[PDB]
Amino acid sequence: KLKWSKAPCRFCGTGCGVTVAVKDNKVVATQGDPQAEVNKGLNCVKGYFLSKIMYGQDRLTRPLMRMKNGKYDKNGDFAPVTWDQAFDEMERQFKRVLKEKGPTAVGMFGSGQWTVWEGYAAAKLYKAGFRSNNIDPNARHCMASAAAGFMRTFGMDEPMGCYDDFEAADAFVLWGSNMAEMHPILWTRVTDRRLSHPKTRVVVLSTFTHRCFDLADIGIIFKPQTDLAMLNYIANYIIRNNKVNKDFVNKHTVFKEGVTDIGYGLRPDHPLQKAAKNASDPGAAKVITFDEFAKFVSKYDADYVSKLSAVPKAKLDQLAELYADPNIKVMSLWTMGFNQHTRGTWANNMVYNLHLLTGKIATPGNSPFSLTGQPSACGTAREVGTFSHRLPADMVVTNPKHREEAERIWKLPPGTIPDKPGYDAVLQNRMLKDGKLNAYWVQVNNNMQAAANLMEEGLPGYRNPANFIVVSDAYPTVTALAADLVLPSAMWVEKEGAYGNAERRTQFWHQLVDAPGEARSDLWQLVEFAKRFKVEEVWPPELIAKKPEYKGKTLYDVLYRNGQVDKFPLKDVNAEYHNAEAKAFGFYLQKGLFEEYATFGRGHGHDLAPFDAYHEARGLRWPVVNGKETRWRYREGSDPYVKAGTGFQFYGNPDGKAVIFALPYEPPAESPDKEYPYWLVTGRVLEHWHSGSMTRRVPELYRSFPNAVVFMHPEDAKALGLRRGVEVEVVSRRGRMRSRIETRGRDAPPRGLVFVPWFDASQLINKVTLDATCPISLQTDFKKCAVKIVKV
Amino acid sequence: GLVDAMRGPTAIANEPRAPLLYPTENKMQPPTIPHKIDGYQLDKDFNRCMFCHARTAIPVSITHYMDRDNNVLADVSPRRYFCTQCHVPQADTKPLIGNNFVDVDTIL
């Protein structure tokens, strides 16, 4: 009676497989997929409520446009309109802005919860169609430091290990990851390894105590940002105790020293930016020797590091010894504590240094493993390259050979792709406020809630009368409330999808149900809108003169009906499932997109299997070469790209070697002071996803954790005259929010620090945070700034 | 018009009064925990839940005693040890908005 079909979980980058039961157009149940290798049948509480996430009573079903006196008005209340009406106004607004200001004044803010084909369609629309690089995603707030860290150390993105490392590690080292709540099924694999093989050690480092400490053998609370000094201490330890894997280092690594004093990614007239010496080229580095590297880290001794970090020397040593001991297989894990960090690219480099010095990489259990947060920050944002500097498969717009290769695959005139990186996430809000980004489309994110410094940048940027803001969502959100046009979107299994998880596993799903009302997928909206633009309106004449076959053609024709993206006909669609977009445009759009996109990575290290293979499997891990997935990269015998006889080949780098970097501790952008004497850390809880727009509309998840709270040390509550349950304002120099004190909760911070989760749309903690970023990756540090706490 | 019930009526620029912390209610999806769990130890030294729910309160089902290969073991699987990844208590308060889910439970 039920029809059960496979899909990845809609939520975290773990990428659990689920099976989904449908009857009469409704998801009636889901279950953890017992045949999926990632989770073998388990989910967490979020996964187990997937059957409720599409059914909030206020699901968007019609376009809503601000209207006054019968026409679009910025000051108008939202009124329902047709799809043609919505797209007419969008078309007017985009064309007006393009003629007056050009493509640097249009933009898109996308998502690592886009399906792979959504992100690819949006990248073509902006980079090849509008000729704008102002497309960037919420994964900018997330994995940008990790991807910069990979490109610097390895020359290619994403982990070289895989989830199988959890069954082989002898020591897990969590560098601020709260896996117990944020990658629950991976933490179950940690817990299984540890309880079943009890010589295994679990080391948890954090700026506050949380549920991971319930398993930890060694728990380390450290001062925000002083992880940089701890990582160097370990490197020094390995060297001073003669535990370098010298053959590995000589064969497979080189050494660089990075430029320092690189500022904090603030507006250029901010005093911190003016103060910095090297903000202009903050990723520069020079070649050095091993010995210069050993000298550099020798400054990071126990006296300096233990005082700076507040971690006792005995613990720094227990930790350093697991890294050093050649017989211990070490899996290091990190998430936003390393990446949302004003030196988080360096921290990424620095944890790879520990593994490179010892040769503990790319083999089972010996695994520096960057955890990804969103379900498709990897499969979509990073691999498709939906970022202001990117092209697909690690390519960059600044490289002329990369632009040539995109223009070849996309059948564009030479010189079509813009060569200068466009506006990244943080800069998009600053340019909106400054009225320089005037037509803007947000899809599958809630960036008004999610971006730091809401009151100074994002809210006045969205409400600026010079700008026109379109938001595609499934539900009302504060982002949609700040927009001018809201488009009702089809979500999760209302559309055929692909998501790529933290271990390079791309997982497909069919469309299993039909969206309510006139909700339509983000994919449909992008490709439909592209019909509204002729090449003569969006391309300089000299490009049309080089491909004159395109005269008078629309972007829909150039980008989507190009002989490639439309080469698979309706008869290729599996007739047992709907496919709304295929029916809408007249060909198998997802398959054509995927196969054209897959041309970028095939034979270049990022190989995706044939489209149909993913509808048959429970994911496959890239590179998929001759039908076989790859579990360990860069290791001979595991990765088909590695030359025989080399042992290891980091073939992202021209000499095949990984880079070890000498980089210092530098302090946060904003630390506590006399006026604002507490650290504010922000983040998540197990039961809610991100902005809460999905989870906090599920009755059981709302009731499990109805409101955000200020987690506070009991001695700090006593010093402030507070008790559990009293209301406070949390206040920074930027803004304020009101919430209740929790001195007895699952997060127990040290004195001087509070933790506030960001899932509650009535408690917008991103009014308080600072949009300072790592200057290399442009990723915001939401994990530390200075606040005071005042009674209401 | 357009309202976000997860925020309530307050414009983005303003700051709503926070509700009280709600007490926890006393009284196939993982069942919710129909009792308070404040102060219950759940760590590698002691699993308070197993104190009443061991197959030795309604006991855990045999699935909870299964490893990754579906071998039934003589004690709770490490994979199920941290109960609160899947089972959650509930505040004694109504949902913010309706939800049109259906459980299979009630449609076969």
Ligand SMILES: Nc1nc2c(c(=O)[nH]1)N[C@H]1C(S)=C(S)[C@@H](COP(=O)(O)OP(=O)(O)OC[C@H]3O[C@@H](n4cnc5c(=O)[nH]c(N)nc54)[C@H](O)[C@@H]3O)O[C@H]1N2
């Ligand atoms: N339940 C749930 N899970 C999710 C999500 C969700 O919304 N809910 N979202 C997913 C996404 S996209 C992401 S990015 C991840 C986030 O996963 P995490 O990064 O694990 O979780 P957060 O709660 O964002 O961050 C809290 C951690 O930041 C660490 N931290 C703070 N400052 C520092 C520092 O200076 N150094 C280091 N090293 N650590 C620091 C603290 O130690 C704390 O453990 O979760 C993913 N999984």
Ligand SMILES: Nc1nc2c(c(=O)[nH]1)N[C@H]1C(S)=C(S)[C@@H](COP(=O)(O)OP(=O)(O)OC[C@H]3O[C@@H](n4cnc5c(=O)[nH]c(N)nc54)[C@H](O)[C@@H]3O)O[C@H]1N2
């Ligand atoms: N203070 C603070 N801020 C943070 C973080 C932090 O740790 N602290 N974490 C940062 C990080 S790592 C990340 S990943 C971001 C996450 O921030 P966002 O991605 O902005 O947050 P989400 O709530 O996941 O937004 C997803 C949106 O997609 C909508 N929706 C669901 N399905 C669909 C669909 O198929 N189509 C469309 N159009 N809409 C859909 C949902 O209703 C929701 O509004 O937050 C960043 N912001």
Ligand code: HEC
């Ligand atoms: C005895 C002092 C208990 C402790 C310790 C824990 N639980 Fe419990 N639980 C207890 C009773 C008497 C009942 C009601 C009878 C029943 O089985 O429902 C429960 C109920 C649950 C449930 C609901 C099971 C169902 O509805 O099918 C769950 C999921 C549950 N309890 C979980 C749970 C957890 C995770 C605990 C540690 C934090 C825990 N219980 C401790 C008695 C007692």
Ligand code: HEC
């Ligand atoms: C997810 C990986 C879970 C973990 C960890 C724990 N439980 Fe569970 N439990 C889970 C599900 C999906 C279900 C329903 C289906 C099933 O396998 O039975 C349950 C059920 C229970 C029950 C009810 C048993 C019954 O006969 O109906 C109880 C009392 C219960 N679970 C308790 C419990 C305890 C104490 C756990 C920690 C040791 C625990 N569960 C972990 C999913 C998950």
Ligand code: SF4
């Ligand atoms: S661990 Fe992540 S992927 Fe798995 S069920 Fe929970 S939210 Fe989904």
Ligand SMILES: [Cl-]
């Ligand atoms: Cl607020």
